[PDB]
Amino acid sequence: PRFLKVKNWETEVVLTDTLHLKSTLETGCTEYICMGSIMHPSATKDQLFPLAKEFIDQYYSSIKRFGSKAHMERLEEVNKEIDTTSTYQLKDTELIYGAKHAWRNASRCVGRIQWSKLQVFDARDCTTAHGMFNYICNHVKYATNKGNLRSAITIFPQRTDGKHDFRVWNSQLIRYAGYKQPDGSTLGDPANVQFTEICIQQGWKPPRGRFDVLPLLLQANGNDPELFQIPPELVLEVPIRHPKFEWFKDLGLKWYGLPAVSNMLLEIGGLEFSACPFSGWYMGTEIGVRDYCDNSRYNILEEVAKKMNLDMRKTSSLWKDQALVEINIAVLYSFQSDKVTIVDHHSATESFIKHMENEYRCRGGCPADWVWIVPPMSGSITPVFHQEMLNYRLTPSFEYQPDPWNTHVWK
Amino acid sequence: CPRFLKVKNWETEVVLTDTLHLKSTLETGCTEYICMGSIMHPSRPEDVATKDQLFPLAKEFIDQYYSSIKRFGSKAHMERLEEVNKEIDTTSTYQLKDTELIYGAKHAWRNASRCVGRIQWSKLQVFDARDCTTAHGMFNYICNHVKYATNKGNLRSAITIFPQRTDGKHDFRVWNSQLIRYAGYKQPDGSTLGDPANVQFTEICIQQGWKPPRGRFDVLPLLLQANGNDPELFQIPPELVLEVPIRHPKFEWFKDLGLKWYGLPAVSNMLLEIGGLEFSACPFSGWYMGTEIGVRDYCDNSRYNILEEVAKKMNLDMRKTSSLWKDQALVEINIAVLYSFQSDKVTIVDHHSATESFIKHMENEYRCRGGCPADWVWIVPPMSGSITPVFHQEMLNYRLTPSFEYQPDPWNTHVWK
Ligand code: HEM
Ligand code: HEM
Ligand SMILES: Cc1cc(N)nc2cc(-c3ccc(OCC4CCC4)c(CN)c3)ccc12
Ligand SMILES: Cc1cc(N)nc2cc(-c3ccc(OCC4CCC4)c(CN)c3)ccc12
Ligand SMILES: C[C@H](O)[C@H](O)[C@H]1CNc2nc(N)[nH]c(=O)c2N1
Ligand SMILES: C[C@H](O)[C@H](O)[C@H]1CNc2nc(N)[nH]c(=O)c2N1
Ligand SMILES: [Zn+2]
């Protein structure tokens, strides 16, 4: 256990990490094998209180009332409540604190300079899929804000016995359908082929277009999930056009403005919130590099490069790289022209470096996953490429969880 | 402690199974509670390996060698072991056979987790220079290496291995970080002429007596240390230094930037570790991936930094980042680099071809060897990461021996005569 230095090899700034000593969860690495590029490496009454205590301790530390009378009483209150009921309920203040710090601790998120501006919607009183739909509609409307996007999270009731889980079966609140074609190719988003088929199996009548917004598939209290249509006036979309290539609009592309991830698990003080959709705004490469140009995604690189009359016979002409830049120029230009919040990867990584300085100064460190922070294009011409980073696991945290259709027992 | 580890390719869904990690030797710097995968170097000169330290390291290497030639447990294996054990017992070190030197050099490359070019690992020309005694002799060896590896533009990978460390006060060192590098000169007004990466080494050469041309692309002299003596300066014969003028297939004006680069990347400041023996002077060379020149050598802010001037000549809007003018310029610079090498028939590989080859290599190594240590942070190219197949490939990073290692710069440790 020592202070660890991280160096920026471009600015020669050296930061000293003390926060990693507070980490208690594991990373997946060992002294002998590093698993930094593995995507997914690796409760009862008895285990719950220490986890609760650790979180309550840090909550009262954060508000400069550690050891105070209310700190004492809250610990005695949580211990007694776990005794009698095998669980406990978070105060509203603790819920907000926990949610913001889960975002603050998300080592893979380049957007964390914004972490303390998070609108937290408490939905722990929800009991049915219809109520989930209401809460989700309100979240989408608030977060969208006519294009002036606002970060938000909506937190549904925590897991109890594991048989009554609340789940949003969608991976994002807003995504486009994908259809397995007769010949074998894909109409729409190939990332959502399985989920789309589930919705059709569940009664959804698919328009079978290239940009069909998917219905919500919502599971309350462990019951069978139910389908809902997001009111279309709440779904903000940007048609993608290019500022110089007049033909780009003829590609017929568009995307949605609100990135709202809804399949992750929020963990606070030992409690597990299996339904907790959270939303911010996009970095342009999320759409223009990954969602449009991945092999198993929309894969428009070939067509764009053709329209640019590029030499596509050899890889060394870098025709993919040229078309990739133009696609990302069009995405940024399109969102900005419609006044929908978006950030480019130069600005976002610049902000993250500034964020890192803040966290080392006030918190003693910032867990960061270089593999995920560095953008998927033009990596070394962003400031994070040359920034050393220490990755470690703090709680409260967002965690992965299995897709519900693998675990659910239909009634 | 499970015996098998799985890695997944999230683009193709191929799953590979790693058992080779069981043979990892030294620490990564990571723990179960922290990952140091993005730290550049996560893990006294006279402090050399002792007898009791050297015995197991030699045995492990000899065993691995005789296993690779399908002679494990043979009479030759046992006799080699006994011979090595008696050398260490009576001389505190031992000498590798030529076969073992060659095997060990090829395998340090095969084990280099940060190298994307390892599909070529078994095609490495090994030059045994362990009979060298003086810096003039090192210069002779290095000149021959350069000429052989350059091969009039049809580049061939090669390593030259000088005598191993003994007591730590008689080290052979190449003080250059690469055999061919351009000088950098800091001006009184703070600006830099030439290559900013090499200002410190350039200043050392000048102090040692080098008369610098004070140009933009001045090939640096070799600064060579034999047997722990003070290092000596030599000029590489310019006819041995193959260079490529950088021009662009569509932009007439690109040649007017006056850019060029050298054909042969030849890293000369690393240490080669084989069976506990330490080869502190072991320059090795291959051929370039274009982005090593076009992204890092030209566009890094602390390097040649020509993004601005290119973007101006392209008449891009440079007043806001969201126009991606930097991204546009970077692609064209890398187009020019590849077109220039190809037009001059100098071997080079683009980052699409290189990463596709590495994936095929990595799958073959999992199949035949049981794994392939790979450092994602270094394997993924510095531009267009996610449109190359390595971006979506999970990797396991661990340290196998024989290995290439970092070592301290020699001017920080050398005891001047
Ligand atoms: C406000 C603007 C935000 C921006 C620009 C942003 C940007 C990003 C990006 C680019 C990624 C990588 C995405 C990918 O590669 O597909 C990411 C990951 C992530 N973000 Fe943020 N984000 C923002 C807000 C938020 C918010 C509000 C939360 C939660 C309250 C959050 C939590 C996360 C998590 C949990 C991950 C991934 C961690 C994992 O998969 O293990 N982000 N973010
Ligand atoms: C044959 C063509 C080769 C290609 C295309 C190639 C490519 C590369 C690249 C692109 C890197 C990362 C460089 C950077 O980002 O600065 C690298 C690193 C490396 N390569 Fe290769 N390489 C080749 C040959 C070789 C040979 C012949 C050897 C040794 C015999 C070697 C050993 C290494 C090592 C030790 C490293 C980096 C390890 C470190 O710095 O920690 N490579 N290579
Ligand atoms: C709030 C927010 C804003 C934003 N601008 N971007 C965001 C991106 C993610 C995100 C990215 C990748 C992920 O991993 C899944 C990969 C396998 C296929 C993609 C996950 C985990 N669901 C989340 C999560 C939240 C984001
Ligand atoms: C045979 C070969 C061919 C090739 N095409 N490329 C090669 C690149 C390296 C290499 C790259 C980066 C390195 O580290 C540099 C960091 C310190 C500052 C940045 C080192 C370590 N000297 C070696 C080594 C050998 C190479
Ligand atoms: C295999 C690799 O770890 C995986 O593809 C990761 C790499 N880095 C990433 N980085 C971001 N931001 N998003 C991703 O989906 C990924 N994928
Ligand atoms: C901070 C970071 O680890 C460092 O800048 C690394 C990142 N990855 C790299 N990858 C390669 N191939 N070469 C490099 O020089 C670097 N630099
Ligand atoms: Zn690690």
| Side-chain-side CA neighbours of residue A98 (13 Å) | 31
CA-CA distance, A336 to A322, in Å (whole number)? 22
Mutate to test the interface with A, among B324, B352, B394 (most CBs of A within 10 A): B324
Contacts of A301 in chain B (CB under 8 A): 387
Distance in Å, alpha carbon of A79 to nearest chain B alpha carbon: 28
Show the tokens assigned to B143: 């000149």
Q: What residue spans define the domains of chain A?
A: 17-124+151-161+265-279+349-373, 125-150+165-236+400-404, 237-259+282-347
Cα A171 to Cα A218, A238, A253, B25, distances in angstroms: 11, 20, 21, 41
Q: How far apart are CA B378 and CA A242, in angstroms?
A: 33
Under CATH, which architecture does the B131-156+171-242+406-410 domain have? Answer: Alpha-Beta Complex (3.90)
Query: Top-level CATH class of B18-130+157-167+271-285+355-379?
Result: alpha beta
Q: How far from each other are the two terminal CA atoms of chain B, in whole angstroms?
A: 52
Look at the block and give the residue holding tokens 């007049």. Answer: A246
Label residue A44 exposed, middle or buried (CB < 10 Å: 0-12, 13-18, 19+): exposed
Structure token pair of residue A292: 């449009």
The pocket around ligand 4, CB under 6 angstroms, is made up of: B 265, 267, 269-270, 284-286, 288-289, 292
Assign B376 to helix, strand or coil: helix
Nearest to B106 by CA among B119, B128, B121: B121
**Token digits for A9?**
């090899």
| Chain B touched by A389 (CB under 8 Å) | yes
Cα separation, B279 vs B271, whole angstroms: 6
**What is the CATH topology of the domain spanning B243-265+288-353?**
3.90.1230
For atom 3 of ligand 5, the residue with the nearest CA is A37
Task: Reduce the secondary structure of chain A to three states and give it as a string.
Answer: CCCEEEEECCCCCEEEECHHHHCCCCCCCCCCCECCCCCCCCCCHHHHHHHHHHHHHHHHHHCCCCCCHHHHHHHHHHHHHHHHHCCCCCCHHHHHHHHHHHHHCCCCCCCHHHCCCCEEEECCCCCCHHHHHHHHHHHHHHHHHHHCCCCEEEECCCCCCCCCCCEECCCECCCECEEECCCCCEEECHHHHHHHHHHHHCCCCCCCCCCCECCEEEECCCCCCEEECCCHHHCCEEECCCCCCHHHHHHCCEEECCCEECCCEEEECCEEECCCCEECCEEHHHHHHHHHHCCCCCCCHHHHHHHCCCCCCCHHHCHHHHHHHHHHHHHHHHHHHCCCCEECHHHHHHHHHHHHHHHHHHHCCCCCCHHHHCCCCCHHHCHHHHECCCECCCCCEEECCCCHHHHCCCC
Give the tokens for residue B172. 């052979």
After which residues is the backbone of chain B broken at C–N > 2.5 Å? 43
Q: Which of B12, B2, B1 is nearest to B362 (CA)?
A: B12
The residues with which B186 forms a beta bridge, in sequence order, are B192
**Amino acid at the residue A127:** T
Q: Smallest Cα–Cα separation from A389: which of B39, B396, B375?
A: B39
Checking chain A for breaks where C and the next N are over 2.5 Å apart, the residues before them are 42
| A271 CB-near residues (< 8 Å, 6+ apart) | A52, A87, A88, A90, A158, A159
A317: which chain B residues are within 8 Å (Cβ-Cβ)?
A: 335
CA-closest candidate to residue B143, choices B224, B62, B52, B36: B224
Nearest Cα to A217, choosing from A248, A255, A177, A182? A177
* Nearest residue in chain A measured CA to CA from B322: A344
CB atoms closer than 10 angstroms to residue A186: 18
- State the Cα–Cα distance between residues B293 and B121, nearest whole angstrom: 22
Q: Are B198 and B409 in contact (CB under 8 A)?
A: no
Annotated catalytic residue within B292, B332, B365, B399: B292
**Which one, of A294, A295, A379, A388, lies nearest residue A345 by Cα?**
A379
Chain B partners of A387 at a C-beta cutoff of 8 Å? 38
Domain A17-124+151-161+265-279+349-373 matching CATH 3.90.340.10: the answer reads: yes
- A322 in reach of chain B (CB within 8 A): yes
* Residue range A125-150+165-236+400-404 in CATH 3.90.440.10: yes
Is A50 part of the contact surface with chain B (CB cutoff 8 Å)? no
Closest by CA to B137, choosing from B149, B124, B148, B128, is: B128
Phi/psi for B250 (5° steps) reads: -125, -30
Pairing assessment for the beta strands A397-399 and A265-268 based on DSSP bridges: antiparallel
**Closest residue to A370, CB basis, from B8, B37, B328:** B37
Is A282 marked within a binding site? Answer: yes
> Under an 8 A CB cutoff, do A379 and B380 touch?
yes
Could you tell which of A115, A261, A291 is best to mutate to test the pocket of ligand 3, judged by most ligand atoms within 8 Å of the CB?
A: A261
Nearest by Cα to B11 from B377, B374, B372, B359: B359
The technique is: X-ray
HEC string of B255-296 equals: HHHCCEEECCCEECCCEEEECCEEECCCCEECCEEHHHHHHH
Q: Which of B16, B30, B326 to mutate to test the interface with A (most CBs of A within 10 A)?
A: B30
Whole-angstrom distance, CA of residue A131 vs CA of residue A266: 20
> Does the annotation mark B115 as catalytic?
yes
Q: Tell me the structure's resolution in angstroms, rounded to a single decimal.
A: 1.8
Q: Is the dihedral of CA B311, B316, B320, B326 positive or negative?
A: negative
3-state secondary structure of B110: helix
Burial readout B234-272 (b: 16 or more C-beta within 10 A, e: otherwise)? bebeeebebbbebbbeebeebeebebebbbbbbbbbbbb
Phi, psi of B261 (to 5 degrees): -145, 165
Calculate how far, in angstroms, residue B99's C-alpha sits from the geometric centre of ligand 3: 52
The residue nearest atom 27 of ligand 2, judged by CA position, is B286
How many angstroms separate the alpha carbon of residue A344 from the centre of ligand 1? 14
Handedness of CA B309, A285, A333, A140 (dihedral sign): negative
B390 SS3 class: coil
Helix (H, G, I), strand (E, B) or coil at B186: strand
- Alpha carbon distances (Å) from A22 to A25, A102, A364, A382: 10, 15, 10, 30
Q: How many CB atoms lie within 10 A of CB B83?
A: 14
The CA dihedral of B55, B57, B59, B64, to the nearest 10 degrees, is -170
List of chain B residues whose C-beta atoms are within 8 Å of the C-beta of residue A391: 34-35, 37-38
Tell me which of B300, B320, B331 to substitute to probe the interface with A (most A C-beta atoms closer than 10 Å): B331
- Cα(A386) to centroid of ligand 6, in Å? 7
Which overall architecture, per CATH, does domain A237-259+282-347 show?
Answer: Alpha-Beta Complex (3.90)
Distance CA B24, CA B22 (A): 6
